[PDB]
Each structure stands twice: as structure tokens, then as C-alpha cells.
Amino acid sequence: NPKVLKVGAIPDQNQDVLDKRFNLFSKELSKQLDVEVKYIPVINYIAAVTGFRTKDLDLVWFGGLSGVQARLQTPNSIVIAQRDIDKEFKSVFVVNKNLELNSISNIKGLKKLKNLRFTFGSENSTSGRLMPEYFLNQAGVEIKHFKGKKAGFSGSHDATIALVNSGAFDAGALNKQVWENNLKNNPKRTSNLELFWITPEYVDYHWVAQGDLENRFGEGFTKELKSVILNLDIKQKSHKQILDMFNAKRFIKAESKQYKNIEEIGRKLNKI
Numbered sequence: 151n152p153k154v155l156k157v158g159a160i161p162d163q164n165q166d167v168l169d170k171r172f173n174l175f176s177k178e179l180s181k182q183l184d185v186e187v188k189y190i191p192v193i194n195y196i197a198a199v200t201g202f203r204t205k206d207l208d209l210v211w212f213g214g215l216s217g218v219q220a221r222l223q224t225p226n227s228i229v230i231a232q233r234d235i236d237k238e239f240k241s242v243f244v245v246n247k248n249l250e251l252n253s254i255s256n257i258k259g260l261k262k263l264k265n266l267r268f269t270f271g272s273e274n275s276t277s278g279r280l281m282p283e284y285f286l287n288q289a290g291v292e293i294k295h296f297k298g299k300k301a302g303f304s305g306s307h308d309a310t311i312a313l314v315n316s317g318a319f320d321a322g323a324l325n326k327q328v329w330e331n332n333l334k335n336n337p338k339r340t341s342n343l344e345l346f347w348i349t350p351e352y353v354d355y356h357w358v359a360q361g362d363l364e365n366r367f368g369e370g371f372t373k374e375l376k377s378v379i380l381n382l383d384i385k386q387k388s389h390k391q392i393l394d395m396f397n398a399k400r401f402i403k404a405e406s407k408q409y410k411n412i413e414e415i416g417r418k419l420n421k422i
Contacts, residue, residue: 171395229406
């Protein structure tokens with residue numbers, strides 16, 4: 151459907167949260183751009199990348215890694231925007247309380263996760279897999295060192311929390327924002343979890359648009375679209391509803407050069 155602007159997103163959180171966020175976003179874009187806009191859910195991160203490649207998704211909220219993947223598979227696509235926090239994003243390592251493991255203060259303390267049952271997020275997650283594995287590796291910890299010589303891949307940050315909180319795994323890593331989100335707001339999900347370590351900063355989430363939108367939507371559509379997103383204003387009611395769902399005060403400009411470190415780490419870990 152070429153007259154419909156199709157919004158996608160990596161499924162980094164439970165679908166109820168995604169539905170609310172992306173449906174509201176899509177409605178606001180629709181009003182401001184005067185085109186039909188539909189949020190199209192996907193089953194996993196790979197599906198977001200593939201949907202974008204096959205031009206079944208036009209505008210997608212990607213993670214660092216998956217956005218890089220998408221843009222490598224889909225030449226001449228456009229980096230649109232990010233949040234302030236996405237310039238200085240962090241992961242957390244969390245542990246189940248039943249371990250009585252205490253927090254650490256130097257990356258080398260990740261050695262204490264050896265011989266535990268460990269879960270990452272999505273195989274293609276920046277904050278729940280790539281960066282955690284990078285830092286584990288810096289500390290001499292490899293996946294083979296976990297219980298079973300393997301790690302879990304939960305597929306989402308909410309799913310990681312649930313797995314470690316239930317005791318299906320001993321420890322995991324996830325999006326720091328999502329963690330703090332749950333700690334404060336929905337603490338029944340984090341009942342059995344303690345903070346183990348906070349990572350250094352890296353770049354993460356961003357919006358990516360197809361590069362050929364002008365042919366469907368007219369001259370200047372992309373600039374207008376970019377403008378809509380960047381001009382969302384917390385002082386406005388409907389805008390604030392959206393922005394609060396992204397846990398941000400605004401969107402800001404983002405560019406492709408920013409993701410060089412993610413791309414390089416992705417190559418090193420054979421995750422491109």
C-alpha cells in the first residue's frame with residue numbers, strides 16, 4: 151500500500167506498550183503530514199530489519215545494531231532522529247536476589263557471572279546483547295563460560311527482566327531506561343532483582359526512514375517528516391502523551407556517522 155506511511159519498531163518491550171506508543175505516534179504524524187499512517191507490528195528484531203529491507207515498513211524505531219543492519223541491507227536510507235539519552239545510552243546487568251551476589255565497580259567483576267545461567271535480550275539487541283557481550287568479553291567472560299556453555303536470548307528487555315525475576319535465569323542484561331522504568335513504576339516485575347553493574351555509555355535508538363519517500367508522498371515529504379518528529383513539543387498535551395511513552399522530553403537530530411562504534415563492535419562479534 152504505497153499511499154500509507156508504515157511505522158515499525160523493534161519489539162524491545164511488551165506489545166501492549168508498543169501498541170499504545172506507536173499507535174499514538176502514528177495518529178499525530180497522520181494529522182501533521184496529512185497522510186494515512188499505520189503502525190505495523192513485527193514478531194522480532196530481525197523482522198523489523200527485514201520489513202524495512204523489503205520496503206514493507208517506511209519509518210522504523212530501531213536500536214543501534216538493528217538500525218545499522220537495516221541501513222546496510224537498505225542502501226540510501228535516512229537517519230532521522232533520536233532522544234538525548236540515545237547519545238549516552240547504558241545497559242544494566244541484573245541478578246536474582248537468591249544468589250546474594252553484590253554489585254561491582256570495575257568491569258573485571260563481571261567474572262563473577264561465570265558458571266551462572268545468563269540471559270541476554272534479543273540476539274540483535276544493542277543494550278541487551280551486543281554491548282553486554284562486548285563488556286563481558288573485555289572482562290574475559292565468554293558465552294561458553296555460562297552454565298550450559300550457552301546464554302539465553304529473551305528477545306526483549308521486558309522478557310529479560312521476567313526471566314531473571316522468575317529464577318529461570320540467574321542474571322541478565324538489559325536497557326537501563328527499561329530497568330529504571332520498571333523499578334520505579336511496576337516493581338512487582340523486579341521483586342527478586344538487584345542491580346549488578348552499570349555499563350559505560352554508547353549510542354542506541356534511532357528513527358530510520360526509507361530514502362525513496364518523495365516518489366510516493368511528493369517533493370519535500372522527508373524534510374517535513376523529519377521536522378514533525380523533531381518539533382514534537384512537551385508543552386502540547388497530545389505531544390506529551392507520545393513523548394512520555396518514549397521516556398523523553400524531545401527528539402533530537404541523529405546522523406549515520408554516530409553509529410561507527412556500534413558497527414565496528416558488531417563486526418567484531420560477527421553480528422552484522
